[PDB]
Design a protein around this ligand. Structure first.
Ligand SMILES: N#Cc1ccc(-c2ccc(O[C@H]3O[C@H](CO)[C@@H](O)[C@H](O)[C@@H]3O)c(Cl)c2)cc1
Length: 159
């Protein structure tokens, strides 16, 4: 089991870390969601699906910078939504193919009532998402740590 990103980096068997750079909607209003879709950013596969089934959770999701300061919301993982920053580990998604499969994670971030102006700065760390991989074969339990950076400023209008 290993993963790759839309910015051309990787995390091998056994886990590790990578950086992910996301384009964000430049304007988000109070009462609306900024969507951060990681399913177009992070992809993984099973290295021996003939025998082994891989299990993958979102173990932890943490907010940073302008997201921590200026937003609240949820994370959608494989069709169900949970609070973000996270408060527990999600259920598992199965990986059972050598073909790349997206990691089905998206953040839905809504501005806090006091937010206004540049609420997320270009280049800044916005989140750290930990993917936990186990399997039905051995005792492997590996963390794939995804450091999520904004490529651009996000503004919350004062109207
Ligand atoms: N014959 C034969 C043969 C026996 C074992 C393996 C083999 C290949 C990869 C293996 O392990 C890697 O891939 C697994 C599947 O994604 C993951 O569950 C593991 O955590 C690890 O990343 C492990 Cl155990 C075993 C490949 C071929």
């Amino acid at each position: 089991f290993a993963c790759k990103t839309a910015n051309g980096t990787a995390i091998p068997i056994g886990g590790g870390s990578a950086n992910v750079y996301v384009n964000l909607a430049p304007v988000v209003n109070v009462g609306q969601n900024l969507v951060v879709d990681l399913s177009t950013q992070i992809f993984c596969h099973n290295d021996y699906p003939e025998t082994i089934t891989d299990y993958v959770t979102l173990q932890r999701g943490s907010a940073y910078g302008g997201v921590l300061s200026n937003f609240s919301g949820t994370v959608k993982y494989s069709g169900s939504s949970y609070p973000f920053p996270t408060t527990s580990e999600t259920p598992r998604v199965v990986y059972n193919s050598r073909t790349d499969k997206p990691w089905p994670v998206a953040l839905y971030l809504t501005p806090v009532s006091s937010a206004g102006g540049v609420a997320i700065k270009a280049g800044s760390l916005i989140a750290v998402l930990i993917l936990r991989q186990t399997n039905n074969y051995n005792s492997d339990d590996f963390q794939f740590v995804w450091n999520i950076y904004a490529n651009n400023d996000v503004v919350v209008p004062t109207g």
